[PDB]
Amino acid sequence: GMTEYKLVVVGAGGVGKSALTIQLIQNHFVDEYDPTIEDSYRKQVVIDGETCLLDILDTAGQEEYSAMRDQYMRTGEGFLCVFAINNTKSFEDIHHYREQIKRVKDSEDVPMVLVGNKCDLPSRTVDTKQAQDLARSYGIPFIETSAKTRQGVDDAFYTLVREIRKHKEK
Ligand SMILES: Nc1nc2c(ncn2[C@@H]2O[C@H](COP(=O)(O)OP(=O)(O)O)[C@@H](O)[C@H]2O)c(=O)[nH]1
Ligand SMILES: [Mg+2]
């Protein structure tokens, strides 16, 4: 039968992890969602003719115990690494997320997609070239998104599934 995949959405507080996840799951933009809530959601989709069940963890940062962070990174099969295009610190944080996930999984080959969110807002500080160069250095896709307009949202999640499939079918 069909397969379930564990996706994990990571990134600095305020980049739009919850807004992106809720758009995919519930098809609306949520303006105020408590930044300290971490929850998971299921969604069945068909990608490349094959039916999937996505189990998506919307992370929120520090855990009661760091061992719990390590556990969700170990069971996670692919990671949406989200920054906001108007927040340079959130982009620099991607370096740390890439390192930490590889470190916890003790692996050099971890499915990931780099997501630059909030493209509909003014005063961008992270240029597309910067992000394209970084994703290229990791060997992963880069997608620009807006949780408000839905630009790129489905693309980002479905591309991550394709990356998971490529890793498993190696
Ligand atoms: N304009 C705009 N605002 C966004 C976008 N994504 C998130 N936000 C806003 O950014 C703030 C933080 O988003 P949230 O989903 O809570 O970020 P999280 O802490 O990563 O889960 C909220 O006020 C959201 O409405 C976007 O693509 N465009
Ligand atoms: Mg959140």
Numbering used by the authors: 0 to 169
Question: What does the primary publication say about this deposited structure?
Answer:
RAS proteins are binary molecular switches that cycle between active guanosine triphosphate (GTP)-bound and inactive guanosine diphosphate (GDP)-bound states. In the active state, RAS proteins interact with a variety of effector proteins, such as RAF kinase, PI3K, and RalGDS, leading to activation of downstream signaling pathways. The role of magnesium as an essential cofactor for small GTPases is well established as it is required for both high-affinity nucleotide binding and GTP hydrolysis. To examine the effect of N-terminal modification on the tertiary structure of KRAS, we carried out structural studies on KRAS constructs containing iMet (unprocessed N-terminus), lacking the iMet (partially processed N-terminus), and KRAS lacking the iMet and with N-acetylation of the second amino acid (fully processed N-terminus).
To understand the role of the iMet, we made a new KRAS expression construct (1–169) that included the iMet and crystallized it in complex with GDP. Crystal structures of GDP-bound KRAS (1–169) in two different crystal forms were solved, both diffracting to a resolution of 1.45 Å. From hereon we refer to these two structures as the Mg2+-bound KRAS-GDP structure. We observed a minor difference in the switch II conformation in these two crystal forms, suggesting stabilization of the flexible switch II region by different crystal contacts. The structural superposition shows that in the Mg2+-bound KRAS (1–169)-GDP structure, the iMet interacts with residues L52, T50 and Q43 (present on β2 and β3 strands) via hydrophobic and van der Waals interaction. A structural superposition of Mg2+-free KRAS-GDP with Mg2+-bound KRAS GDP structures shows large conformational changes not only in the switch I but also in the interswitch region.
